[PDB]
Design a binder for this molecule. Structure first.
Ligand code: ATP
Ligand code: MG
Lengths: 202, 217, 49, 97, 98, 88, 96, 146, 51
């Protein structure tokens, strides 16, 4: 759970106590990581990038420099430089940290998923050519990256291999919405059936 | 003291209160002896004009400029950079601006503040210019867009993505068929959203009942 | 205090910079000499509320 | 005005008008636009789908033949109501109050 | 103890009223300030801020004040020479409070 | 085998030439290609077998059901159905 | 018999269907209402196991019961939308 | 001459520009202090803009959709000048359209809202029931008087 | 000739009081609960159909 990690760790930037506590250097990095995941673009801007405290700490730890790069390049919609940044963030930040060793793999998956999301929303169609070149990989590599997240139903998109395009088919309509609703009521109908019956016997 | 309060406000995106500080600051440095304070005065002159560029006033540029001393005792490269960019902006022409900052690059490079607020000004005019083009069309070519704005195609496409996430006309771009479709329709229905709160609550409630009703067991 | 801990005293002495701000607000409502130097008036006014 | 009136459908294709009136498909559109202008008919003109879908019939001379049509069409309507009624009696027979 | 409704001819308690009822009318005009805004002001930009801090700000954000730990803003006394709008100062703010 | 491939491919194709329908369902002789067509009730038009026609033929049988009013359920029946449960 | 009748518009109105702008508004208000009264009902079952029924009624607002209030709210809306779907469907099949 | 001119512009018509120009060139264009002056040559040029805006307004109301290829022909304009004229008249807020740059269609409609359509439908049903209710009375009236 | 002009019963307010007193019947059509309006909906179809 990173949602509670981002609420505490971003707040603790602003009035931070080091009297029988840990360094600000570890916390500013650890805070950026968990904010990147949980916050969406609008709140990303408010609470990470336009954070005065994070600004003032500047680039003085290699760790700090690594995660800072990554959020900016996600934000400003650049893709060329995102692919090598991601690799550096993992090497210098996630691993040395004991606690993010455990969340190392998840970071890589989600991070690609997040940059795809922004691109997929904003476009109806892409080429396999243009998308690959833009992130800074190839046609053969892109096809594998996408075969991870699409069968898990994250991105809601198909790739026309025949045509050479990446088609977008993210539902935003009523059908998508109705499905969410019935999943809430079906967990209710079952839970009534168990509590109701059980009392009926005794 | 006054100038520094000026810079800070200009940056907070308030340009009236900012303007009065830079006005004072211009007057202070003109009235002190000029040995190094002309330099500081010229810099401030760029910032008074800069406040008003952002408000989109060229009347009050006419009032502040004068051939008495603000173009004959402070005749400089920054003046020529300002009335180019001022004039460009009103025309609603990004082309013109683009050409004005090519030959006045040194003004962006030397001035931190001038640059922050010209970065904003760029984004603002491009955003404005776009809305007008895409209102009366749908299924407009991305290539067509490039003709009117005066930018490379590849640039236009990256810029427009951001403004879908910015979420002021939010459509979808066709890279492979080279169209833009504009969608401006509602992205939820009200009864469905109020339903979400309602079934969520019932999920909790049934657990709570059972806690009270487990006395039978 | 406790009745009235906040107490705002309003001057009329003002500042030069303060007078520029009253003018602008007015100017939005009806532009005053928009082809001539407004700024003379500001200097000249020196007690005005 | 006459053909859409006697037919049950209230949208007419361009090709229908072209054969009947003996005119090019071009000339047909023109005719439709002028009917909207007069108030002979009113509605929407669809060139792409090649329709004119009417929303108003201006009241006409009524001859014996048209009454026959109007009467027929209401017999079907009366039968439609009656069949729905038989269904409405079957469901809910057991409880009404 | 608060105002309440009684039937005319049954003379009994049949229905209830808010206590708001049967008390002073609240602004005898319409509540809000006429087209006069922070734009029209023209003051006094700072001191108007101090009035916003005092009146609207606790009411909009309660939680913020709880963080400082202070009790919420005390009464305001508006005094000075007239033609300062001081009366208009309160109306402008109150407009925007909701 | 030749039967099961034929029931499946109604949902999988819209047409095949005579060469291609032979290769797929494994017919051995040319005459066998057309004989199996009459029996699975696909017409041959212009040397091509059409699975779309079987689709339609299936569709007409559904309509000759007298089962289908209550099964699919009229909109009017559903509303009545909900109403009366309460009234019990 | 004379009193009971009030024209033929008495029965014609059963077929008559209002603006659907209105229906959506009524159904919207009711949805929110049930959440807000479900919370009121959540407070009712906050514990509610201390002695004597009368002292619970006053304490957890069992007087002017939130369970009864939820029940009425649901039923008015459920039944109304039942008639609206039915009259609509009646209209479709009957006219055309 | 003036009478046909006023009449044309008031009532809703479809008309083509070089044929209207041919009608009023030997008539109105040679009348001075209107069209026959020099800087009124550019008030004659202006007469065209007003004719092609008249056709745009008419066609907007009656035609829900029309191909762009067609619309060009009727207006007597080139493709480029059609798009810019549609655009200007959509800024000025009178009409509304969505023009394709591939030049397949122009959809002169402002895409209708869900609630209004349903509203419109519910009213028609009340008019049918009212119509029958009044008719039945007048049947009784006619039969007996006969 | 005698032309039909719309009429409806609407009652005066002073009349009303007595209308309330004399109606002590359950009212098959009164526009009540679910039950009352399912009886109506059927009644309504046969009304129109005869018209
Ligand atoms: N800041 C302002 N910008 C615009 N107009 C202003 C401003 N301040 C005052 N005025 C104008 O002057 C008028 C007089 O101000 P106002 O009625 O608030 O007086 P006051 O100082 O409360 O006096 P008294 O002592 O009688 O209570 C306002 O109604 C307004 O028209
Ligand atoms: Mg006063």
């Amino acid at each position: 759970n990173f949602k509670e990690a981002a609420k505490l760790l971003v707040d603790s930037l602003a009035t931070f106590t080091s009297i029988e506590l840990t360094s600000y250097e570890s916390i500013a990095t650890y805070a950026s990581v968990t904010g990147l995941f949980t916050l969406e673009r609008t709140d990303l801007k408010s609470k990470v990038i336009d954070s005065p405290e994070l600004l003032s700490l500047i680039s003085t730890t290699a760790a700090l420099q690594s995660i800072s790069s990554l959020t900016i390049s996600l934000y400003a919609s650049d893709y060329a430089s995102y692919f090598p940044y991601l690799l550096e963030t993992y090497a210098n930040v996630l691993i040395p940290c004991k606690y993010l060793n455990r969340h190392a793999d998840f970071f890589v998956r989600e991070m690609r998923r997040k940059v795809y999301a922004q691109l997929l929303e904003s476009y109806k169609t892409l080429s396999l050519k243009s998308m690959a070149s833009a992130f800074g990989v190839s046609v053969a590599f892109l096809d594998n990256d996408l075969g991870k997240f699409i069968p898990n139903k994250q991105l809601n998109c198909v790739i026309d291999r025949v045509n050479g395009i990446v088609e977008t088919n993210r539902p935003d309509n009523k059908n998508a919405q109705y499905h969410l609703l019935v999943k809430q009521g079906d967990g209710l109908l079952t839970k009534l059936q168990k509590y109701g019956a059980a009392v009926r016997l005794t | 003291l006054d100038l520094m309060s000026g810079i800070l406000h200009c940056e907070d995106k308030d340009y009236k209160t900012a303007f009065s500080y830079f006005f004072e600051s211009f007057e202070s440095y003109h009235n002190l002896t000029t040995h190094n304070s002309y330099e500081k005065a010229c810099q401030v002159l760029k910032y008074m004009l800069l406040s008003k560029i952002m408000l989109n006033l060229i009347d009050d540029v006419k009032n502040i400029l004068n051939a008495k001393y603000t173009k004959e005792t402070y005749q400089s490269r920054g003046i020529d950079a300002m009335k180019a960019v001022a004039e460009a902006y009103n025309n609603r022409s990004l082309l013109d601006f683009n050409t004005a900052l090519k030959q006045y690059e040194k003004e962006l490079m030397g001035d931190e503040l001038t640059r922050s607020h010209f970065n904003a000004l760029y984004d603002t005019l491009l955003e404005s210019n776009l809305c007008k083009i895409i209102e009366p069309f749908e299924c407009v070519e991305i290539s067509h867009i490039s003709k009117i704005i005066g930018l490379d195609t590849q640039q236009v496409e990256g810029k427009l993505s951001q403004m879908i996430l910015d979420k002021i006309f939010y459509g979808v771009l066709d890279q492979g068929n080279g169209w833009l479709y504009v969608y401006e329709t509602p992205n939820q229905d009200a009864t469905y959203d109020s339903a979400l709160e309602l079934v969520g609550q019932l999920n909790k409630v049934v657990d709570q009942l059972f806690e009270k009703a487990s006395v039978l067991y | 205090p406790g009745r009235l801990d906040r107490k705002i005293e309003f001057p009329s002495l003002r500042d030069r910079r303060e007078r520029r701000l009253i003018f602008g607000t007015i100017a939005s409502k009806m532009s005053l000499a928009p082809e001539a130097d407004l700024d003379s008036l500001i200097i000249r006014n020196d007690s005005l509320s | 005005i006459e053909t859409v009136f006697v037919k049950n459908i209230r949208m007419l294709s361009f090709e229908d008008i072209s054969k009947a009136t003996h005119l090019p498909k071009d000339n047909v559109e023109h005719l439709v636009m002028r009917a909207i202008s007069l108030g002979l008919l009113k509605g929407s003109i669809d060139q792409v789908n090649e329709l004119v879908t009417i929303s108003w019939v201006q009241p006409r001379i009524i001859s014996g033949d048209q009454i026959t049509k109007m009467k027929d069409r209401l017999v079907e309507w009366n039968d439609q109501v009656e069949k729905l009624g038989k269904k409405m009696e079957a469901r809910g027979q057991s409880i009404w109050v | 103890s608060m105002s309440v409704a009684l039937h005319r001819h049954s003379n009994a308690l049949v229905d209830i009223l808010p206590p708001d009822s049967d008390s002073s009318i609240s602004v005898m005009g319409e509540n809000e300030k006429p087209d006069v805004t922070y734009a029209d002001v023209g003051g006094l930009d700072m001191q108007k801020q101090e009035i916003r801090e005092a009146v609207e700000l606790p009411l909009v954000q309660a939680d913020l004040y709880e963080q400082i730990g202070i009790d919420p803003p005390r009464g305001v006394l508006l005094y000075g020479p007239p033609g300062t709008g001081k009366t208009m100062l309160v109306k402008a703010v109150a407009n925007s409070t909701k | 085998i030749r039967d099961e491939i034929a029931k499946n491919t109604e949902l999988s194709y819209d047409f095949l030439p005579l060469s291609n329908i032979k290769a797929l369902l494994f017919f051995n002789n040319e005459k066998e290609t057309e004989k199996f067509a009459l029996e699975r009730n696909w017409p041959i038009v212009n040397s091509k077998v059409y699975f779309n026609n079987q689709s339609k033929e299936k569709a007409d049988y559904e309509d000759e059901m007298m089962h289908e009013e209550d099964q699919k359920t009229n909109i009017i029946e559903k509303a009545m159905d909900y109403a009366i449960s309460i009234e019990n | 018999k004379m009193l009971m009748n009030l024209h033929k518009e008495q029965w014609q109105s059963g077929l008559k269907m209002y603006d659907y702008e209105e229906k959506e508004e009524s159904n919207l208000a009711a949805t929110k209402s049930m959440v807000k009264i479900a919370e009121q009902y959540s407070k009712r079952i906050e514990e509610e196991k201390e002695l004597t029924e009368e002292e619970l009624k006053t304490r957890y607002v069992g007087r002017q019961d939130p369970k009864k209030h939820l029940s009425e709210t649901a039923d008015e809306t459920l039944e109304n939308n039942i008639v609206s779907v039915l009259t609509a469907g009646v209209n479709s099949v009957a006219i055309k | 001459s003036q009478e046909s001119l006023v009449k044309l512009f008031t009532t809703n018509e479809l008309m083509r520009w070089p044929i209207v120009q041919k009608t009023y060139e030997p008539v109105l264009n040679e009348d001075d202090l209107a069209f026959g002056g020099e800087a009124n040559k550019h008030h004659w040029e202006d007469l065209q803009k007003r004719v092609i805006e008249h056709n745009l307004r008419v066609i907007s109301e009656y035609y829900s959709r029309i191909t762009l290829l067609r619309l060009n022909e009727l207006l007597d304009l080139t493709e480029s000048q059609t798009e810019t004229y549609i655009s200007d008249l959509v800024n000025q807020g009178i009409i509304y359209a969505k023009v394709n740059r591939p030049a397949k269609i122009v959809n002169f409609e402002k895409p209708k809202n869900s609630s209004q359509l349903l509203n419109e439908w519910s009213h028609n049903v009340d008019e049918l029931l009212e119509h029958i209710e009044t008719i039945g009375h007048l049947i009784t009236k006619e039969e007996i008087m006969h | 000739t005698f032309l039909h002009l719309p009429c409806t019963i609407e009652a005066e307010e002073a009349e009303e009081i007595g209308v309330e007193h004399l109606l002590r019947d359950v009212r098959d059509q009164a526009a009540g609960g679910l039950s009352i309006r399912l009886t109506n909906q059927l009644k309504s179809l046969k009304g129109l159909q005869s018209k």
